[PDB]
């Protein structure tokens, strides 16, 4: 007849497992594909385009236009992500250092880690110990990277592995064909002589034949990471369940919901205020479209690589808008807010919205002396007392007091402002309707937002806090004036 399913469980988060998502997981998580670079339609309504940026299927940012995925308003909409496909892969600025580290760890020919069987067994035994901490993991990573950089030849395939370093910005160079002062090897000689046709057709290749090392573009790096044996992934100190080496090179971009990208419709002019992330995503889509157009029309390789580097730089700015190796000709004109900038800083999420955040049911007022009050008592004005309300639950003890408070109404100081019934959570304003009928129908368990009366514990603080005594819980006493008064003997703690 009816199936047993639990309504709600008191679930408590145990721990947060950080990791990475592969392009397939990004596609699976996303709901729609954003391919249109424009924001609104051509009509005068300026409605958001479909399958484009600012689409309402990825959440909502306006109180009037609800979400298309879930039929809820802005207050109840959590938001949905989208996935944008890139024509050419790009290095992840966040994991770029990790990419370089991995490339230095593994071979560039067979994709195996530069470690002997004995060293592999030693590291596996040292890592299998329980209670491995973050510091120990980083130390083991450092040691393994050092011991891998010590070697220069591969024990699995025998291919030579030179130094891998960073050149320019978001470009990696592997010195495979390094200059050998002693007797040169056959491989480097073959590589140098293979430029016969290039020198014949372009003499400028011969003087610049040197310094011609391997350039590990995102394509080759991704192809190498896709063929890394899973046995060596643990040796890279990267959790296999968290992510894979192929996930460091991003091929899809996760456009966030509209809850993170608030849009203000400024009807006073022919424009709207949008965040920087929207413009960055629009520019990325435009660059992808331009790259596709040049590929179809058969453009030159120089401008193709220029567009690829520009796309990489724009993606890096979208991730971290404050870099140092940005060329001057490629330097941004204005300043944009990236995710890194929104996270770090004094106004960031950690310091501005998690560690310290603004709250309601609070006030700020000037102070004045009043020695006629106890040290544990503080004076509150009637005006502020009528605004800061306290939710008292109707019980068998204070039933008549709450009845009288409701009968008084929001006008008289001793009273309440709103009533929340026990059965239904629909609040009722006491300024309208017959307050006597509401007082006569006060059931046990209801919530009454009573005014701040005498005896209520209230926190009193001075914004500049040096020690814990700068904020103390006192007993509130209502007074007809408009200032917070307290015993002057308590001035020394607050300073």
């Amino acid at each position: 007849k009816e199936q047993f399913r639990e309504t709600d469980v008191a679930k408590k988060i145990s721990h947060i497992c950080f990791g990475m998502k592969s392009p397939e997981e990004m596609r699976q998580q996303a709901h729609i594909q954003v391919v249109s670079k424009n924001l609104y339609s051509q009509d005068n309504q300026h409605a958001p385009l479909l399958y484009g940026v600012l689409d309402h299927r990825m959440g909502t940012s306006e109180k009037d236009r609800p979400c298309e995925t879930c039929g809820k308003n802005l207050a109840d909409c959590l938001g949905h992500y989208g996935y944008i496909d890139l024509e050419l892969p790009c290095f992840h600025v966040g994991y770029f250092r990790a990419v370089i580290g991995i490339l230095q760890m593994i071979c560039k020919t067979c994709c195996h880690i530069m470690l002997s069987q004995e060293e592999k067994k030693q590291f596996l035994d040292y890592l299998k110990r329980p209670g491995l901490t973050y510091l120990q993991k980083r130390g083991l990573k450092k040691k393994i990277s050092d011991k891998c950089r010590k070697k220069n030849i591969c024990h699995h395939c025998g291919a030579f592995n030179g130094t891998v370093k960073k050149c320019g910005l978001l470009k990696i160079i592997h010195e495979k064909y390094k200059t050998n002062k002693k007797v040169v090897d056959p491989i480097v000689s073959n590589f140098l002589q293979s430029f016969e046709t290039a020198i014949e057709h372009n003499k400028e290749v011969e003087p610049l034949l040197g310094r011609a090392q391997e350039n590990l573009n995102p394509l080759v790096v991704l192809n190498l990471f896709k063929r890394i044996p899973a046995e060596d992934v643990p040796l890279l100190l990267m959790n296999p369940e968290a992510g894979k080496p192929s996930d460091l090179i991003l091929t899809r971009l996760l456009v966030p919901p509209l809850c993170i990208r608030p849009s203000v419709v400024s009807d006073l002019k022919s424009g709207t205020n949008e965040d920087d992330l929207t413009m960055k995503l629009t520019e990325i889509i435009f660059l992808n479209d331009v790259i596709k157009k040049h590929r179809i029309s058969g453009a030159k390789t120089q401008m193709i690589m220029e567009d690829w580097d520009f796309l990489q730089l724009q993606c890096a700015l979208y991730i971290n808008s404050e870099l140092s190796g940005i060329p001057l000709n490629m330097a941004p004109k204005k300043w944009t807010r990236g995710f890194v900038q929104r996270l770090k800083g004094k106004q960031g999420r950690f310091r501005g919205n998690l560690s310290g955040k603004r709250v309601d049911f609070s006030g700020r007022t000037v102070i004045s002396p009043d020695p006629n009050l106890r040290i544990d008592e503080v004076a509150v004005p009637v005006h502020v007392a009528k605004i800061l309300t306290f939710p008292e639950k109707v019980n068998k003890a204070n039933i008549n007091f709450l009845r009288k408070l409701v009968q008084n109404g929001p006008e008289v100081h001793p009273g309440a402002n709103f009533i929340q019934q026990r059965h239904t959570q629909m609040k009722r304003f006491l300024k309208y309707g017959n307050r006597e009928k509401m007082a006569q129908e006060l059931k046990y368990g209801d919530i009454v937002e009573r005014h701040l009366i005498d005896g209520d514990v209230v926190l009193f603080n001075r914004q500049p806090s040096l020690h814990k005594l700068s904020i103390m819980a006192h007993l509130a006493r209502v007074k007809p004036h408009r200032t917070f008064r307290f015993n002057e003997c308590v001035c020394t703690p607050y300073n």
Binding site: V35, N38, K293
Partner: protein, 86 residues
Amino acid sequence: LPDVVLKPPPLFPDTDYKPVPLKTGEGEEYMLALKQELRETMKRMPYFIETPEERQDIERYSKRYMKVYKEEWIPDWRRLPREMMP
């Protein structure tokens, strides 16, 4: 400038090149038949260990009639270490 696209590209874009047909001959067909025979015969082999069924509802007189019987190979414990003896 590149034109704007209203709908996303198809999930499976069409290609004008088709896969080359498979090689034909008695050898390929014989290899296919032998691979099918191996698939059919290697599942019933004792080496193919199946998931041990559990949570029997009840015991019945027909148990002895429906009891699955199959010969079990005896591993050579001389070559195998001692940690794998039952």
